[PDB]
Amino acid sequence: PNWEFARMIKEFRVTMECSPLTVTDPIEEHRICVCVRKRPLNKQELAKKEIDVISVPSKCLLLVHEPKLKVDLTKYLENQAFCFDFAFDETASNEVVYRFTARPLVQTIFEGGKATCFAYGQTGSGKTHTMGGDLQNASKGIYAMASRDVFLLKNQPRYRNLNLEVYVTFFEIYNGKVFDLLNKKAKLRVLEDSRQQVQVVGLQEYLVTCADDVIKMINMGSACRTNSSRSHACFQILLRTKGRLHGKFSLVDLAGNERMEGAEINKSLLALKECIRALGQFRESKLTQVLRDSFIGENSRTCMIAMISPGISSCEYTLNTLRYADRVKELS
Ligand SMILES: Nc1ncnc2c1ncn2[C@@H]1O[C@H](COP(=O)(O)OP(=O)(O)NP(=O)(O)O)[C@@H](O)[C@H]1O
Numbered sequence: 001p002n003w004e005f006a007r008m009i010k011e012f013r014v015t016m017e018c019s020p021l022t023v024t025d026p027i028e029e030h031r032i033c034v035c036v037r038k039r040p041l042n043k044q045e046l047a048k049k050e051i052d053v054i055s056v057p058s059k060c061l062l063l064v065h066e067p068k069l070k071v072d073l074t075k076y077l078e079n080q081a082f083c084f085d086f087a088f089d090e091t092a093s094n095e096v097v098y099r100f101t102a103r104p105l106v107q108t109i110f111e112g113g114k115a116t117c118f119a120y121g122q123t124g125s126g127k128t129h130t131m132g133g134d135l136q137n138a139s140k141g142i143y144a145m146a147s148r149d150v151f152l153l154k155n156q157p158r159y160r161n162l163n164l165e166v167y168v169t170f171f172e173i174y175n176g177k178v179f180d181l182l183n184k185k186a187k188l189r190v191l192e193d194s195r196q197q198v199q200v201v202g203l204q205e206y207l208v209t210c211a212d213d214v215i216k217m218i219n220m221g222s223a224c225r226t227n228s229s230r231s232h233a234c235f236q237i238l239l240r241t242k243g244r245l246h247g248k249f250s251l252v253d254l255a256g257n258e259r260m261e262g263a264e265i266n267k268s269l270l271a272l273k274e275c276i277r278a279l280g281q282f283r284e285s286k287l288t289q290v291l292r293d294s295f296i297g298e299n300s301r302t303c304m305i306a307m308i309s310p311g312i313s314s315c316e317y318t319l320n321t322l323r324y325a326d327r328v329k330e331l332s
């Protein structure tokens with residue numbers, strides 16, 4: 001009868017009654033995790049007296065108090081509810097966010113898989129702040145934190161005998177072009193044989209043996225990135241043993257989702273969605289071409305973090321971000 005609606009409702013309920021030990025449940029497969037993070041109102045917004053229209057009453061529920069006018073101009077609220085694996089409020093720090101998003105994926109690369117974590121949302125929603133550090137401070141961002149746990153795990157008995165070497169890369173995608181951020185914005189070439197795997201010729205891999213090393217490459221890369229979006233940022237952590245790639249973690253700082261380059265940005269985001277959904281089961285773009293091998297394997301996991309700016313003036317941008325997020329998790 002209305003089985004489709006019944007399915008959507010059951011999925012919402014299931015997500016609403018899940019325990020944190022769901023995505024972080026080893027011996028259990030969860031290739032796709034979707035979260036949302038609300039940032040607090042900033043100085044400028046508070047000064048302009050922007051109203052905060054976002055509430056996160058539980059760890060999986062986010063509420064949008066959408067301002068509306070009836071035909072006769074009467075003011076009311078259409079309070080909409082969204083459910084995610086994890087919903088973070090304005091008091092959540094980067095370490096807390098990191099703990100429930102990228103942290104559970106590190107093990108995946110040591111188990112020989114390919115993990116990806118994406119920061120998605122509108123311009124100024126907190127994407128760069130979350131992935132790269134507060135602003136500036138590399139150590140306080142997910143790239144750093146993830147690196148920190150990679151060195152801790154590699155020194156664990158279960159992995160010691162792997163004799164792995166840790167490598168890092170940092171590049172940005174701008175208008176279908178790839179630029180090495182660790183090799184002075186050097187423009188790189190992207191090729192794809194017939195067997196279809198992609199290779200980024202010239203991308204520089206740097207050996208790191210310490211978190212301080214990684215922090216030096218993050219500062220360097222962020223210092224010469226094209227703050228503001230306009231590009232896709234992608235910081236990678238690769239594990240190698242003997243000529244072979246053991247595992248790889250690609251952390252992506254996406255461009256704002258809201259000069260007709262927005263066409264390339266929208267195509268990449270449309271492409272990203274279908275690649276992630278294809279993971280739990282085109283019209284290609286550079287981003288999805290470069291990260292292709294991280295969606296095709298069976299031992300691959302991904303996490304999507306949707307950033308939201310709480311201001312009333314950004315309500316339409318928020319709904320757009322949330323609905324995109326819904327469709328992504330829809331494949332889990
Ligand atoms: N959780 C947060 N707490 C405090 N400040 C934050 C937080 N998230 C973001 N900000 C700040 O708000 C701005 C948005 O930062 P980021 O620079 O994080 O945005 P995007 O990366 O969201 N923007 P864009 O590059 O235009 O797509 C920066 O000035 C951040 O320092």
Ligand SMILES: [Mg+2]
Pocket residue numbers: 127128129227228229253
């Ligand atoms: Mg940014």
